[PDB]
C-alpha cells in the first residue's frame, strides 16, 4: 500500500489510509525509506514503531507496507561476524561507507552473497518425501564448525523433485526442486524466520553433564548445567568480563553468542578488539576463538527498539544453531537496560505501568523469552540432540528488593548467584554471597557425580554447613569479642577463614587462580575436610588448640600453598602431589595428636 504520514511524535508515527495489515509487520516509510513495524491499529490510522532517527519528515510522505513480521537470515557466513540489534553487518556497512558514521536507509544484506561455498549433497534421493528439519546436504563454513548442516525450514513439505550437484556455490541459487503441489518449492542455501515465534522441536529432555567455568565457587558449590540458565550480577570489580572469558575459553560450547545493549562503547570497542587477541584453548591452539563466537553489540545510542529486539535476535540465532544438535551459550550485557527500554517504550505508547515504572506483562515477556532455553532432541529424520544454555547479567539499580525484575527472575530461574557488597568493599572478589545463592540441579546431578566423584556431594554439604555455622557464630562473637570459647570455636573460625581466602579469593588472571578443573577442586575439598576432621577429633580429648597447631605447625600453610599447584600439568603429577599432601597431613595429625 501507499500510505500518508499523518502525525509524527519522536519515535512514533501515525499513518493514514492503512487497511488490511498485521500489527506486527515490517514497513518502509518516508522518502528515505526507513524501517518500522506497525504496533497498534484502528480504522485506517496505524501506530508504527520506528527503528531509526526521524528528522525533517513531513505529512503525506509515501508509506510502503511489507506484509511480513520481523525475521532474521539463517545460513552460512553467520559465524565470526558482528551485527547490530536488527541484524545489519557492522563491518560491511563500515567498509562500504568508508566513513565513521551510519547512513539512514542502508540495506546491506545480513548474509553476504559475495562468498561461494563447497556444498555436498546429503543422502536424500530425488523422488523421496521430505519434511522440515531434515538435512539434505552440508557445506563447509570453517575448520572448527566444518560441515555446516543444511536443513529444510519447518512448515515445508513435499517430495524432492531434484537435487543440486556438489561443488562450489554461492547463495541466491535454487538448489532443491520440491513439490508439495506444484514446483513452487524453490530453496537457496539460506532462509529466514520470524524472531518472535520460537522454532518447534521434537520434544524436550532432562539435564545433566554439568557446565564448567574454571572458578571454584560456581562449579563446586552452586552447580551449573548446560541446557539451563542463571542470573549473575555484574560489579565491575568482581570480574565483570573475566567470567565471560573463562566461559568462552573453557566451557565445552560448540557456539558462543554475546550481546550488547547497555554497552558504554569503551567496553564495546575493547571486548570487540580483544577477542582477536583471545585464542581457542581447545583441541590445539587455534588463534581465532571468534570461530565459535558471533556478537550482537548495540550501544544505548541506537534507537530503543533495537535494544529491545537484540535479545530476541540473539536467542533465535542460538536456536538455529542448536537445531543442528550442538551446545550453545548466551551472554547478556545488562538485562536491567532491556527492562528500562521496555518501560520506556510502554510509557511512550501511553499506557500506565503498575510496578513503579514497569508494565505488568514484563513478567510474562521475560518468562516467554527465557523459556526457549534448555535441552531437546532436534526435529527431523537426522535425529540431532541440541542444547541451549544462557546466562542473564542482572545489573541492579543499587539495590536488591527495589527492582521487581529481580523477583521476576528469581520466580522463573532455577540457579541464582547472588552478591555480597561487603566482599567488594574488601576487594574480596570473587564476590558472591553464599547464604543467598542456590542451585536446584544439585539434586539430579548426583546421578552424574556418582560416576566420577561419588563422595563429592556429602563433603561439599558438610563444608557448606561449617561455613554457615561460622557465619552464625560471627554475630555472637562480634558483640562480645573473645570470651570463654572452646578450641572448636577457633577451629571453625580458622577453617572458615582458610576456605574463604582460598575458595572465595582467586586472581582472575593466573594459571592457577583463573581456572580450575573438577578433580583439583575435589582434592582441595578433601584436603580441607581431612584437616578439619582430624583437628576436631584430636581436640576431642584434651589437646589444647594452641599447642595442637604448634605441634602440627604450618599444616594450614602446608595446604594453603596448594592453590599454587599449576593445573594442566599432567593431572597425575598434581594428583600425586595431593596424595602426598594427604598422606603427610594424616600421618602428622595421627602423630602430633599423640
Amino acid at each position: 500500500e501507499y500510505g500518508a504520514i499523518y502525525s509524527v511524535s519522536g519515535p512514533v508515527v501515525i499513518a493514514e489510509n492503512m487497511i488490511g495489515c498485521a500489527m506486527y509487520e515490517l514497513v518502509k516509510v518516508g522518502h528515505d525509506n526507513l524501517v518500522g513495524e506497525v504496533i497498534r491499529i484502528d480504522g485506517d490510522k496505524a501506530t508504527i514503531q520506528v527503528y531509526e532517527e526521524t528528522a525533517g519528515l513531513t505529512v503525506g510522505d509515501p508509506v510502503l507496507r511489507t506484509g511480513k513480521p520481523l525475521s532474521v537470515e539463517l545460513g552460512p557466513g553467520l559465524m565470526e561476524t558482528i551485527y547490530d540489534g536488527i541484524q545489519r553487518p557492522l563491518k560491511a556497512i563500515k567498509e562500504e561507507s568508508q566513513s565513521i558514521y551510519i547512513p539512514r536507509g542502508i540495506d546491506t544484506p545480513a548474509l553476504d552473497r559475495t562468498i561461494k561455498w563447497q556444498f555436498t549433497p546429503g543422502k536424500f534421493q530425488v523422488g523421496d518425501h521430505i519434511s522440515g528439519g531434515d538435512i539434505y546436504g552440508s557445506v563447509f563454513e570453517n575448520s572448527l564448525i566444518s560441515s555446516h548442516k543444511i536443513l529444510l525450514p519447518p512448515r515445508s513439505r513435499g517430495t524432492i523433485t531434484w537435487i543440486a550437484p556438489a561443488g562450489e556455490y554461492t547463495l541466491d541459487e535454487k538448489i532443491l526442486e520440491v513439490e508439495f503441489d506444484g514446483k513452487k518449492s524453490d530453496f537457496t542455501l539460506y532462509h529466514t524466520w520470524p524472531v518472535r515465534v520460537p522454532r518447534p522441536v521434537t520434544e524436550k529432555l532432562s539435564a545433566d553433564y554439568p557446565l564448567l567455568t574454571g572458578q571454584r565457587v560456581l562449579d563446586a558449590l552452586f552447580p551449573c548445567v548446560q541446557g539451563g540458565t542463571t542470573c549473575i550480577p555484574g560489579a565491575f570489580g568482581c570480574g565483570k568480563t573475566v567470567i565471560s572469558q573463562s566461559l568462552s575459553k573453557y566451557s565445552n560450547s560448540d557456539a558462543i553468542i554475546y550481546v550488547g545493549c547497555g554497552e558504554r562503547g569503551n567496553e564495546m570497542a575493547e571486548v570487540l578488539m580483544e577477542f582477536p587477541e583471545l585464542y581457542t584453548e581447545m583441541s590445539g591452539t587455534k588463534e581465532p576463538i571468534m570461530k565459535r563466537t558471533t556478537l550482537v553489540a548495540n550501544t544505548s545510542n541506537m534507537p530503543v527498539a533495537a535494544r529491545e529486539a537484540s535479545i530476541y535476535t540473539g536467542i533465535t540465532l542460538a536456536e538455529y544453531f542448536r537445531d543442528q544438535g550442538k551446545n550453545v551459550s548466551m551472554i547478556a550485557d545488562s538485562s536491567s537496560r532491556w527492562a528500562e527500554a521496555l518501560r520506556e517504550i510502554s510509557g511512550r505508547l501511553g499506557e500506565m505501568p503498575a510496578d513503579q515504572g514497569f508494565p505488568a506483562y514484563l513478567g510474562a515477556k521475560l518468562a516467554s523469552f527465557y523459556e526457549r532455553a534448555g535441552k531437546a532432541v532436534a526435529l527431523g529424520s537426522p535425529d540431532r540432540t541440541g542444547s541451549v544454555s544462557i546466562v542473564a547479567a542482572v545489573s541492579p539499580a543499587g539495590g536488591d528488593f527495589s527492582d521487581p525484575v529481580t523477583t521476576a527472575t528469581l520466580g522463573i530461574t532455577q540457579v541464582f548467584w547472588g552478591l555480597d557488597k561487603k566482599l567488594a568493599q574488601r576487594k574480596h572478589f570473587p564476590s558472591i554471597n553464599t547464604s543467598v545463592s542456590y542451585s536446584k540441579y544439585t539434586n539430579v546431578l548426583n546421578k552424574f557425580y556418582d560416576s566420577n566423584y561419588p563422595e563429592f556431594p556429602v563433603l561439599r554439604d558438610r563444608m557448606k554447613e561449617i561455613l554457615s555455622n561460622a557465619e552464625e557464630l560471627e554475630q555472637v562473637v562480634q558483640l562480645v569479642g573473645k570470651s570463654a570459647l572452646s578450641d572448636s570455636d577457633k577451629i571453625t573460625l580458622d577453617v572458615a577463614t582458610l576456605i574463604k581466602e582460598d575458595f572465595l579469593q582467586q586472581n582472575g588472571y593466573s594459571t592457577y587462580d583463573a581456572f580450575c578443573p573438577i578433580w583439583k577442586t575435589f582434592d582441595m575439598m578433601r584436603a580441607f575436610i581431612s584437616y578439619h576432621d582430624e583437628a576436631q577429633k584430636a581436640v576431642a580429648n584434651g589437646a589444647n588448640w594452641s599447642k595442637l597447631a604448634d605441634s602440627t605447625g604450618d599444616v594450614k600453610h602446608a595446604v594453603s600453598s596448594s592453590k599454587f599447584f599449576e593445573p594442566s600439568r599432567g593431572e597425575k603429577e598434581v594428583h600425586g602431589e595431593f596424595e602426598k599432601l594427604l598422606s603427610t597431613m594424616q600421618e602428622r595429625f595421627a602423630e602430633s595428636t599423640d
Binding site: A4, T58, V59, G60, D61, P62
Partner: protein, 59 residues
C-alpha cells in the same frame, strides 16, 4: 623586589610594536585578496540571485 616592580613597567612599549607586527601583514594581505576573487564572486552571486527554481511539493 623594587627592581622587579620597576622592570614590570619596562614592558609597555614592546606590546604596541608586537601588535603592529602581528596586524600589519595580515591586514595588507586581506586587503590584497579583497581584489583577486572580488569580481569573480561578484559575478557568481549576482548570477545565482536571478535563477528561477520552479518546484512543487508532492506528497
Amino acid at each position: 623586589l623594587k627592581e622587579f616592580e620597576q622592570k614590570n613597567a619596562g614592558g609597555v612599549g614592546e606590546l604596541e610594536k608586537k601588535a603592529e607586527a602581528g596586524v600589519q601583514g595580515e591586514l595588507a594581505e586581506i586587503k590584497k585578496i579583497a581584489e583577486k576573487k572580488k569580481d569573480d564572486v561578484v559575478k557568481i552571486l549576482i548570477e545565482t540571485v536571478i535563477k528561477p527554481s520552479a518546484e512543487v511539493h508532492i506528497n
